Design a protein around this ligand. Structure first.
Ligand SMILES: *[C@@H]1O[C@H](CO)[C@@H](O[C@@H]2O[C@H](CO)[C@@H](O[C@@H]3O[C@H](CO)[C@@H](O)[C@H](O)[C@@H]3O)[C@H](O)[C@H]2NC(C)=O)[C@H](O)[C@H]1NC(C)=O
Ligand SMILES: *[C@@H]1O[C@H](CO)[C@@H](O[C@@H]2O[C@H](CO)[C@@H](O[C@@H]3O[C@H](CO)[C@@H](O)[C@H](O)[C@@H]3O)[C@H](O)[C@H]2NC(C)=O)[C@H](O)[C@H]1NC(C)=O
Ligand SMILES: *[C@@H]1O[C@H](CO)[C@@H](O[C@@H]2O[C@H](CO)[C@@H](O)[C@H](O)[C@H]2NC(C)=O)[C@H](O)[C@H]1NC(C)=O
Ligand SMILES: *[C@@H]1O[C@H](CO)[C@@H](O)[C@H](O)[C@H]1NC(C)=O
Length: 387
């Protein structure tokens, strides 16, 4: 039921993670557009599919992809800002909309990749039920820059469950925000304390990629990673397995076995984001080391504000009721020039709590996902600044 389009391809093809891509032709409603091969194969590419073929728009173009109107959909846009003969990739500035929602605006894939030190870029969105049978994806080149063109290498539309419900509003009394109908952009998706998980090993058929979190640690210490044995079973109970694959829950980052120092420090991650949006932080948890409630009890801070702490700190077993049972909690934080970081940073910090006299002083995180919530029918932010 997935639609994985390699834009500008001639024939179907399979990538290095055994995903099958089909030509975008049948879904492109705009005639006479140009396709172009990239003339350089960056060593960082894990496959030529779909990155080595592109479609290049010098006028607006529209894709029409059939979707079931009441189901949520993941949308992925794949960009390889390489060399295409006769074009300067630095002249590419454009917008992308999904129905009436602006995804990208004045978007420079080249500048964005230069800032991340990446050769290609994948933008991933989760679109709420649309009530339409067609998802219209519109590429519009900037009319502000002449020579401006738009380009695309791959488009995926992937049906997905309603994995979003409510988020706890950070810095507020029991205040809860509804996210069931939100349109999201994925900012980060981390398998905390474990290996990269390729899309082929994701749960729910969702082919999400989960990255090791170490590149985002900003505390002086990296903590201690924990990994359950190969055969150890995660008992989802009634939690949808599409939430996250077992290997997210079978691995974790903790502060470690030395409790006195753990009280001396936070485990700290930091992330660059766009200002003037609310973000959902989904923290994934599973205790597979300790056995009872009130043994691992810790505070969680988000942008220096208490997310779980004071008289209600995080206790994974307190939440789940058993080893090997997974759970997660959603927290919502609004990021403006108030926060950062110059308004462009999310920090996540964990440290032991002494509340209730826990047996140990430690903290733990198994997974992390960060989503931008759409406001004013817009998810687009500025291009990053390379230095
Ligand atoms: C479309 O997006 C591009 C983003 O690449 C915008 O151009 C960029 O604008 C920024 C800020 O206006 C420029 O950076 C600034 O330079 C000065 C002087 O060094 C510095 O003091 C500032 O702190 C900042 O670094 C940046 O050079 C410029 N990039 C390019 C390639 O021109 C553009 O304005 C956007 N257009 C619209 C209509 O939104
Ligand atoms: C994040 O949100 C703030 C708050 O809305 C944005 O700042 C606002 O930006 C607008 C337009 O840039 C400002 O209004 C304009 O004022 C100029 C004179 O400076 C004039 O040409 C117009 O009358 C126009 O209304 C507004 O004053 C300003 N407000 C505040 C509180 O800063 C900010 O741009 C947003 N940041 C991003 C990255 O989107
Ligand atoms: C762990 O993380 C938080 C970071 O927000 C720290 O608690 C903040 O500490 C600073 C100064 O250290 C204060 O200005 C803030 O008001 C504190 N926030 C809250 C909600 O109390 C904490 O100091 C860090 N370190 C340790 C050892 O806990
Ligand atoms: C949190 O505290 C640090 C202290 O160094 C500060 O720089 C930052 O702006 C604060 N706010 C955040 C991270 O939102």
């Amino acid at each position: 039921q997935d639609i994985s389009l390699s834009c500008g391809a001639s024939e179907p093809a399979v990538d290095q993670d055994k995903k099958k891509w089909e030509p975008d032709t049948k879904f492109l409603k705009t005639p006479n557009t140009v396709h172009a091969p990239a003339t350089y194969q960056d060593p960082s590419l894990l496959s030529t599919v779909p990155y080595m073929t592109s479609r290049i728009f010098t006028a607006p173009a529209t894709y029409e992809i059939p979707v079931k109107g009441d189901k949520r959909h993941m949308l992925r846009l794949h960009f390889y800002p390489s060399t295409y003969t006769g074009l300067n990739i630095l002249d590419s500035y454009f917008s992308v909309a999904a129905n009436d929602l602006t995804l990208l605006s004045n978007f420079s894939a080249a500048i964005t990749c230069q800032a991340l030190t990446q050769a290609y870029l994948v933008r991933e969105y989760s679109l709420a039920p649309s009530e339409k049978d067609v998802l219209s994806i519109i590429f519009t080149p900037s009319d502000k820059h002449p020579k401006a063109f738009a380009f695309i290498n791959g488009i995926e539309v992937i049906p997905m469950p309603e994995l979003f419900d409510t988020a706890s509003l950070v810095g507020f009394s029991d205040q809860t925000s509804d996210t069931k109908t939100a349109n999201l952009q994925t900012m980060f998706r981390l398998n905390v304390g474990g290996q990269d998980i390729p899309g082929s090993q994701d749960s729910g058929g969702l082919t999400r990629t989960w990255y090791n979190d170490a590149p985002y640690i900003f505390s002086a210490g990296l903590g201690v990673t924990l990994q359950a044995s190969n055969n150890f079973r995660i008992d989802y109970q009634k939690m949808p397995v599409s939430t996250a694959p077992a290997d997210v829950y079978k691995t974790a980052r903790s502060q470690g076995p030395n409790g006195d120092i753990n009280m001396k420090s936070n485990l700290t991650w930091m992330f660059q984001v766009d200002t003037n949006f609310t973000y959902i932080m989904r923290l994934h948890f599973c205790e597979f080391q300790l056995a009872k409630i009130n043994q691992k009890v810790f505070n969680i801070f988000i942008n220096n504000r208490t997310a779980q702490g004071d008289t209600n700190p995080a206790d994974i077993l307190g939440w789940t009721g058993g080893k090997g049972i997974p759970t997660y909690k959603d927290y919502a934080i609004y990021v403006d020039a108030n926060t950062g970081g110059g308004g462009e940073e999310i920090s996540l910090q964990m440290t032991p709590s002494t509340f209730g006299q826990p047996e140990y002083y430690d903290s733990q995180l198994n997974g992390l996902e960060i989503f931008k919530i759409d406001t004013m029918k817009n998810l687009a932010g500025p291009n990053p600044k390379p230095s």
